[PDB]
Design a protein around this ligand. Sequence first.
Ligand SMILES: [Zn+2]
Ligand SMILES: [Zn+2]
Ligand SMILES: [Zn+2]
Ligand SMILES: [Zn+2]
Lengths: 539, 97, 107, 83, 93, 184, 681, 119, 99
Amino acid sequence: VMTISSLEQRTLNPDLFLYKELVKAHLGERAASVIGMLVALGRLSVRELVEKIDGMDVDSVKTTLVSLTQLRCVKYLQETAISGKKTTYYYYNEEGIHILLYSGLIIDEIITQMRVNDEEEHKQLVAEIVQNVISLGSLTVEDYLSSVTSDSMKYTISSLFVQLCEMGYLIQISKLHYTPIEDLWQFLYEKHYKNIPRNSPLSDLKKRSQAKMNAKTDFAKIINKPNELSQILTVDPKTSLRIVKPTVSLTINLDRFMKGRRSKQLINLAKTRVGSVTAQVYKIALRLTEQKSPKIRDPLTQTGLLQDLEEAKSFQDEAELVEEKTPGLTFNAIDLARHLPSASLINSHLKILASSNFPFLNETKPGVYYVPYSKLMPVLKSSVYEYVIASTLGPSAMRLSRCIRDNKLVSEKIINSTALMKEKDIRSTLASLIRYNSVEIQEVPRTADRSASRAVFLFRCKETHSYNFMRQNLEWNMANLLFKKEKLKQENSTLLKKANRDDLLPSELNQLKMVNERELNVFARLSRLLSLWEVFQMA
Amino acid sequence: YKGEVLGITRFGLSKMRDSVLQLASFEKTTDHLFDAAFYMKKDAVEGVSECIILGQTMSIGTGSFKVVKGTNISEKDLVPKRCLFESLSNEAALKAN
Amino acid sequence: IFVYQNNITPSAMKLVPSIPPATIETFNEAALVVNITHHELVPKHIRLSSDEKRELLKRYRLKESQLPRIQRADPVALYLGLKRGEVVKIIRKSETSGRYASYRICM
Amino acid sequence: EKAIPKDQRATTPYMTKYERARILGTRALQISMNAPVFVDLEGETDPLRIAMKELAEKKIPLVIRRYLPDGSFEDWSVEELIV
Amino acid sequence: MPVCKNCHGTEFERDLSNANNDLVCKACGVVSEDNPIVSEVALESREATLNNARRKLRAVSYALHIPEYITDAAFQWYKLALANNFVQGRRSQ
Amino acid sequence: FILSKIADLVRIPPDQFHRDTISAITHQLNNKFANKIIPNVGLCITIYDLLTVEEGQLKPGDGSSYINVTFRAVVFKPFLGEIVTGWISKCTAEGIKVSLLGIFDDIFIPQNMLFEGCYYTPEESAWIWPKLYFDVNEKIRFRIEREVFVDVKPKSPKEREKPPAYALLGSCQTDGMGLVSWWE
Amino acid sequence: KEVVVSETPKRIKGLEFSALSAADIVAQSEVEVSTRDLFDLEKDRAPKANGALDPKMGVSSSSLECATCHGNLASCHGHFGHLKLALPVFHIGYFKATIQILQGICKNCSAILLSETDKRQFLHELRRPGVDNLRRMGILKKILDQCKKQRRCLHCGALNGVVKKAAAGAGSAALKIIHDTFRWVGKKSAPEKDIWVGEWKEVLAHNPELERYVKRCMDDLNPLKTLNLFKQIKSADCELLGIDATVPSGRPETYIWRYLPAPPVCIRPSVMMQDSPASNEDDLTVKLTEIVWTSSLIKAGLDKGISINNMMEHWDYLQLTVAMYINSDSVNPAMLPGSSNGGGKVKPIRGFCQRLKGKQGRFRGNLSGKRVDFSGRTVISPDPNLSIDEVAVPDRVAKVLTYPEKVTRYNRHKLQELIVNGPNVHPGANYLLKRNEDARRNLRYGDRMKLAKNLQIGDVVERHLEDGDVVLFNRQPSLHRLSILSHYAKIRPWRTFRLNECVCTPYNADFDGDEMNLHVPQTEEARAEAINLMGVKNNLLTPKSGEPIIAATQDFITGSYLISHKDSFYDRATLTQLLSMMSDGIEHFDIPPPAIMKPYYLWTGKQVFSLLIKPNHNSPVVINLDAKNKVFVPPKSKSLPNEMSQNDGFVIIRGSQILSGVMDKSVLGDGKKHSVFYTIL
Amino acid sequence: MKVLEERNAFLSDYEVLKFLTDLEKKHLWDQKSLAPELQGITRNVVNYLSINKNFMSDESFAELMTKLNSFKLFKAEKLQIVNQLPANMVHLYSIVEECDARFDEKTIEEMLEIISGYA
Amino acid sequence: TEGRSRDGGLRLGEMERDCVIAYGASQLLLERLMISSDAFEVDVCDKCGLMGYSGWCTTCKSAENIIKMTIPYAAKLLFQELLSMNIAPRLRLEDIFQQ
Ligand SMILES: [Zn+2]
Ligand SMILES: [Zn+2]
Ligand SMILES: [Zn+2]
Ligand SMILES: [Zn+2]
């Protein structure tokens, strides 16, 4: 019926769907459909692909596979069973194509390092750098700068140079680095039950906890090995100053893009509940401490290991106090009052830190002006969701959905009491909500076994399902919006390549601005939705 | 036939037979079909009580052997013929390269 | 092979088979009294070799599977200690037209 | 899984009695479509009976194609193969 | 109602003799339908009031020994007089 | 013009069994193709040669003798840029639709490489040039470039034509084009 | 012009089963049922605008055309329809499935609960090429229940108990599914339970009337809940739960109803008007035409009005109809009915799962058991003067029971005559189908003659059933390989199927009042597939014991005995006439020298029976044998053979003469192996 | 049905028209016989292939290759010279890449000379 | 249709049909339970096998990949009465010839 329906393209593709359009909208061709198989069908082996895609065996698979790997679009492992030989298993890389999915706000990450050089081709320079770096995947300043012209100013060219370090940009990607975290927890969970020097036969507990402990502490430096090591930072060659190790291949570490994009959201939450001035103080206050907060890195092994009715807590509370403690000494006791506009006498203007009270910050060593951190984010994140259904379901929806938050599993009779309106409204702004999930239902039978009109109903939250009703936001228009970008490319499909290789006509000029402002809208959307989506996937 | 001793019973024909139309055609009808779809059973059309449904021919019995007529052909008549339009104009492309 | 006496504990069987390069083979003492192959009915069983299989599967031009199967453990199998995917040539005898043989595989 | 050369044959050289079935059937059906007849047609009509009248002479020009189980094909002439 | 696709005949005879049940025209001979496929074997304000009218209708109906016929004859008259809303406010009897 | 190797399934009814094989084969091939056009290659004419005919099968429900062969036949897809005889037959103020006798006119040559100096008349001539117009049925050398393959057979009961199943296009950038006596 | 038409003869390989997706249905259906029922009673009789029955969904009678593709009944196959259905609901066929698919996943974060390599462990096993469907099912039983014994999740941190499918078998709440907390296990502090006991603190202490009275309800998974649960169970596991993810069927979403497709009207034939505009319904159309109602109720509901407690009983009732729709299960667990009830307690409420299921609804009887065409039925009477392998067929049912003939060459001089008879005499045709495949013709047109003077070589005529076509012949509930036989049909008068008695035993037709079935084949080969294969003489034996199943019974035995009797004699008159009566004429007998001579002449009944086997000298029957016919008295062990037993004895045939013995079943009685008929055969 | 080789053997028409002609001698021979429907194309394609020759030869095909093997014409105009624009002036120059360009006098003229061998 | 009165036509039961199987008569059986009773054309789309009328597939507008063929009408009626109920035996296909 009319095909403008747009159901096939719509409903039946969750999760996986985003990827195989992204790569399709990005790499495309055969290079895409492989990942579509790879996500959907799980871990997969080189030969086994060809039994399905019909992709001309060991041709596309190999070529497109490495075509992904330098862009790290796959998770990569190889090993052998006890029989012998060897085999390779794969996955869809991490968040992976995610790197592509932003790439614009990764362009915006200039603004942080943008300081000390403003309104320059130096801007355009480092932009050209990064937009070449992600596109080309792994880079080396030796091969890149080598391809870059000679007879210019080396330490002036490199832009980053002494900057390559910062928090973001790049790190060596080393071997098992992008070997999947979950599985390297298994390989490292060897060596411990694997090596038990016949300690005692009794108490597998002494075998167990020690293993996990050994598994934890040995894992610690594993992610910290790439985190920072001076092999990059320290080197200072002859006739020069401190250099990186351009001998090494590096790739953008998205964790400090996680942190960076996120701290902006922590702002826009704070830029509400305080005054714009002290807000700005909070705005730069993160810039110093936005380094060491694990943030989207802290979940880490929260994936891959069975949780516990206890040990899961001993994992939580560990993340609660940790860096608020040791990096707490890296965190803000007395700031430099870095730049600031406020002016004249600037010090008590700084004492305003206490003006932040609820619902975040506002904890310290007793009376040095300071903020909690590793515990902050947990007591911060949980309350980052804010209004996710405002100007979508109507404001009336908030008040009771907010009310359902305070108490729990509450019945509409007393919802009609605490909250208030003619029931004629509740049965809309509530019932209309439940279709979008959130509230769900509790129900209990009364004076019946279980029946139709023989019981009472209660309403609850289950914020998991709530906080999960917005992962449709992934499948939502990040589904459609990206099509919009693609399926319109066919309007000028013959005109596009004409306009690219031409640099005329009335109708050519006619729809240029049309399709273009069109685009700039579709990516404006993508930026907005992206900014919202920045929350629910982690933190 | 399979190691375990079973069969003849609603449970019996679920011993081996992959055909879910006959396992549908026999005893439990509805839920052989539903179960069959939920696990997306492939069910190649093979046996007799299977084919008589689709009404195609039968694998066993008279339907056991395809029958064919000989063409009585002389492959001496199968050699192509041309005056080699190709061969003459070929040598114009052999130079300057 | 060792044997049980009376009890058989799923504790033991929970992880019994811990040796991939080798195996273990377990009997319950009640199950060994008279050897089954020696009984009356059970016809003589022969375990043909690896390569001896290939000859067979060439005679009838057959893949693996698609054969009459003996479920491992079968009383006979354990006594004869078949492994996964072997072929026991069974020589049976019944007076109909005479003696003959059929083959079974261990699945 | 190709054809098997006629020199080596494992199969019953006699008629399988389904031979007599489908061969007469198909041959008859062809005769019903106005196809030539290779036996002297005595005074008589209708397709099937003249087909019987034909195979009695083993003049039927067909080839029965037997499939072994694996798809190793086969061939036999109708003339060669014996009642 | 259809026409012979050959003779353009305007009249058909069904043929019930030999249990074919043909359908063919005298001037054509061409059939038309062979194989004569032949079968075998809530809550509303107005409709409810119509049911009630049926009940009070049947009730008084046989009481006078009137035809089952004439009642469903007159029930329609009630449905008609409902349209002009003559029947709204006057004693139902 | 050129030759090509295609595989197909020939169905010979019993009738021809008296006639020798290759003749009946070729015959059913012709009754199948002749004028008919195989798409995304371009139309055939006749069946030139024959080869690889093997023992033909017989299906159970019919009894028609079935064979499948492959061979080479005479198609028309000459090449892209080319000059050949033709003329105006059914055409607009835009570039003419050229015609060769008895085969087809599918070829509509637009207005592009065709000489810039021109003026249209509704009478007889399409575009008269600074060198002049041209005649129907007259031998006319024209150049072709692009061909279009569209089958487009969305036969619909709601719909119960658009037949440009095969067509070519071009224009003439050199002289003597559209009228041969300009050159020669 | 004319792009080439390439078509290939094709046959089926396999049936891919699957659930239709959500979207795919409307991607088929022409028109939303949506709307409502009413069948617009106005203007035409139920012209049925949009709604349940819509012309562009299909048609019913031969009345009006089909919209989408018109051409009424014969030419249109029906077309589906789709139903916007507010809120989703369980699917009674996939229900217990849905309890498996939901059984094996932690309902919190909605990821497959089994973990690490052990996931890969099973995954590897499923992909080994030789795996049967049985190994699929069983291995799935082993992979599932690992869930129940996985006592908490892996990366969610939450836990799960067992999901019990509340109550049983009722259909009242039975489709509601409940799963929340097993194993309180005492001293365990469950942070869940903790937050649990803490939640009801705000109700018990608030609205105490419930308190611990109605307590211990666990919680439920609402079907609406279970959708927004399933939609995160995708990729990764996917087929580990048994569903190959080919990315066409969209993973365990479809299995709960969202768009309910409406079957074509040709599945839902509107019953004949049957005398006045009241036009009998069919039951499903009443069902779904109610589903539209109780849906659009909730659709207009839930938008503005109604209420939470006056909602879920509706949407429930929806669940009970849609499952009620496709299966039996729930009948009346005090649920009470909807539109068009009357409250009469009518038990046969369904025309669905049953029509596909048991008895003879369809699957068993109407598909594998198809009722047939070109047939006949009649009582029976013997006709022994008729040979074996014929059936006397009463011509009055021969006139209407026809066999097609493609008139070819040889066939003309019969057939271009055979029409001119016309089918009110016996040896003629009735229908005629010319070469141009138009429709067909018959007698009622007159003409013929000049018509029959054309008769091209491809034309099809339909003969009456002549003398010697191939009739296959059947008895009763058919015990074994011998019921269906063929016979060369022979057309006689009176009216009944007259077989030859020697074939009484395979049918065990007693004559009496029993009834046979005639089936003519149609395609020109099926004849040769009956008479030449399945025929009498080739089935003369029986498949089970390899035993003659057709022989003399009753009269034919005992009559032979009286001629077989040592006491009897015959004279050249009586003999000669017998031997003539034995084959009605037609044959050449060489009278053997008379058994006894001089006092007159006589031939012994043994001889006059010998000639039965070997009438001429040119018949190639040379036999020999020996046997014991029953009631065999022993001789004295004095007698070396059993030959000399007092009342005959061995029937011993040599040189194809009978030497000694009365016959009497045994030798000529089908039962034992050593039989004159069996040996000769 | 399945197409094994799409572009296979470039076939010009020199004796190909003679091949259609021999095919026509087989069945129905064009016009005069007394004195399949396929015949429609026969009379058609035979038409222009015959007339521009008049407004043919056989062994000239063998005479055709002689100096024709000495050029850069590739396969395109190399077959094209055989029929259309019988190798004269700017006609032959109007098609093939670098038709005059590099090679001029005897190259374009001896085209007029060789066609005098046939035409 | 059943019995006399209505009309005629007779009954091969699940019990009886086996008989002609034991003989091994294929073309007879197919000549009985197929041609003689309900002979019916269906247009199936090779891609995503489903039934369609005349030209169209209607799940994917095509009138192209569809192949005509014949089939017992009861069998179609089962493909709908099934496919109405949510399930789809989607038909694969293959050509008869070339093995
Ligand atoms: Zn007519
Ligand atoms: Zn229609
Ligand atoms: Zn979980
Ligand atoms: Zn399709």
